[PDB]
């Protein structure tokens, strides 16, 4: 169980350590990614000047690889070379192949603006660059945890928990309902998505602890946001509406067996640094393809979540507290 800092309901990171000298880093634990990377002491990028860095020469368990490698995200690209060392997470440890990031200039509105050091991917092997086995999968094979599964509990603002290996029943109320993945790549399930009256049937729903908002395709969201008198502030991913809006629907998510719903409180919040009568919609257009939605943090802040590699599925339940 790993404690997660919450920053404005948009970002969550917790502690991890690399190496013999227990070098601490803050990691976005990221179910939409499948590589661990940390900024190197050889990272010259401005983003890196405020981060905790990794010194291989300090760790006696460090093993050299040095193969060059790149990871792209929706928010930018990092670049470095592979290295091998022992990664610790809570009281769990394993050797792991990870990225010493050297150039983080391409992540660089976000990286210098945020307080995270690196990303720790919690996706499947096939999503990863270099075909690396996931931490939780490996941990189970080494018999360091009871089951190859992990759990996210995110709050609403004043901590959250990544929990590896077992299900803690205190995190939720009522029944836990699992959903088979349509592919073992992202944590991705089939769903009929309703945004009010606009429906896309059997969409590709991607459960991602590393995405701050709900996401739909641009085409589908032009439709929805048009008739919702919102406004985009020119040229940043900020859609604003009045905080007292009666028309904002509870979004719906149907599976072959289960209905999930997301109320407006979970997908919007006030601009408390600007005008608090105006409200910011945690819904962004992101085009992956014709039918992919990211069920990001808004979803997860309502719904306690279980990612189970043994079942190849995601378990959802209404979070407690």
């Amino acid at each position: 169980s790993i404690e997660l800092d919450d920053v404005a309901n948009l970002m969550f990171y917790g502690e991890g350590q690399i190496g013999t000298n227990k070098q601490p880093f803050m990691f976005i634990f990221d179910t939409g990614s499948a590589n661990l990377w940390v900024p190197s002491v050889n990272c010259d990028s401005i983003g890196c000047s405020t981060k905790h860095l990794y010194d291989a020469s300090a760790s006696k368990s460090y093993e050299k690889d040095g193969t060059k490698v790149e990871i792209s995200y929706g928010s930018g690209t990092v670049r470095g070379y592979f290295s091998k060392d022992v990664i610790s997470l809570g009281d769990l440890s394993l050797p792991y192949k990870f990225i010493e990031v050297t150039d983080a200039d391409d992540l660089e509105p976000i990286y210098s603006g945020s307080e995270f050091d690196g990303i720790l991917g919690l996706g499947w092997k096939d999503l990863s660059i270099g075909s690396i086995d996931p931490v939780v999968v490996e941990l189970k094979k080494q018999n360091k945890i009871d089951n190859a599964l992990f759990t996210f509990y995110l709050p609403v603002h004043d901590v959250g928990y990544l929990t590896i290996g077992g299900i803690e029943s205190d995190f939720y109320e009522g029944p836990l309902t699992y959903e088979k993945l349509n592919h073992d790549l992202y944590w991705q399930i089939d769903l009929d998505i309703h945004f009010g009256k606009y429906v896309m049937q059997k969409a590709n729903a991607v459960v991602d602890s590393g995405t701050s908002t709900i996401t739909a395709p641009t085409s589908f969201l032009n439709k929805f946001f048009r008739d919702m008198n919102v406004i985009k502030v020119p040229f940043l991913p900020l859609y604003v509406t009045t905080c007292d809006n009666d028309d904002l629907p509870t979004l719906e998510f149907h599976s072959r067996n289960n209905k999930y719903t997301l109320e407006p409180e979970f997908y919007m919040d006030p601009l408390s640094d600007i005008d608090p009568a105006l409200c910011m919609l945690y819904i962004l257009p992101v085009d992956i393809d014709d039918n992919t939605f990211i069920l990001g943090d808004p979803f997860m802040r309502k719904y306690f979540t279980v990612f189970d590699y043994e079942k190849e599925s995601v378990g959802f339940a209404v979070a407690k507290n």
Binding site: L10, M11, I28, D30, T31, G32, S33, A34, N35, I71, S72, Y73, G74, S75, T77, I110, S114, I119, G121, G123, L127, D208, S209, G210, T211, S212, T213, T215, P237, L284, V286, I294, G296
Partner: peptide, 6 residues
């Protein structure tokens, strides 16, 4: 904010 891989 943040959208996390390609």
């Amino acid at each position: 904010x943040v959208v996390x891989a390609x």
